[PDB]
Design a protein around this ligand. Sequence first.
Ligand SMILES: O=C(Nc1ccccc1N1CCNCC1)c1csc(-n2ncc3ccccc32)n1
Length: 269
Amino acid sequence: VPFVEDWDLVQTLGEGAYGEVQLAVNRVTEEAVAVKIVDMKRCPENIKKEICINKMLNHENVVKFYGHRREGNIQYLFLEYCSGGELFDRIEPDIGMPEPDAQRFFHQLMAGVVYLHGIGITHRDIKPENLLLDERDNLKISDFGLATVFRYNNRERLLNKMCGTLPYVAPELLKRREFHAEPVDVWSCGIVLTAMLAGELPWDQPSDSCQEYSDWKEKKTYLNPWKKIDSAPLALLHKILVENPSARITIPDIKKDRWYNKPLKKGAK
Ligand SMILES: O=C(Nc1ccccc1N1CCNCC1)c1csc(-n2ncc3ccccc32)n1
């Protein structure tokens, strides 16, 4: 058993356009889970898609989906709780974080992205606010509200929907009518890596009109944020933040990168 199906809402984890995320604790087991609550009266289609995609997810670096409950016009998505909070909060403004910590988070982010791409899913909005940490500081990708299928029955479909978050979005999304999904998620991962190592975002958007983006294209790496980044991870960023998505490094090649494979001091937590 009796009561095992009861959950107590104990605290608000966050509030935003998606609704709110609360921490819930099981009345009997004390198991902690996150609950995304949405007033479907203010979706029903978006919600269904998010649930359908969540149902496909089973990986250690992706927030797990436990199920959902519909109480009238309120939808309840039960998700894996990540007590370590958002990666965003581990990034010190203007500083970033220690390189070994950034590398470990990057390895884990890559593992989650490889998994998603392997099942034909693109996240479309990778950024530190959406990357969560568990009790051992293991990274988990969250928020599949913009996620979509880019490969089905072994055939790729090109994307055309402009979406994401400007400082993280790849340049082809702003310039081209259609584009491949994978390089767009690679690019945002490179912006996340830059933020972790420098504590700042390099540009407002990767447009010709953006001076900071122009400076990067001109290899002015003596300027911030680049100047703050050691040569080895900077060499990886030179391969990721490549304007032409067809020339941009792919994940299998990121896995062969020198910095990616450099032993640094960091363990779980
Ligand atoms: O799936 C989750 N969230 C989630 C699911 C769907 C849309 C948005 C979110 N959030 C919004 C706030 N930033 C993170 C993504 C989720 C699973 S655990 C969790 N947790 N855990 C700790 C925590 C602290 C702040 C915000 C969310 C948090 N959130």
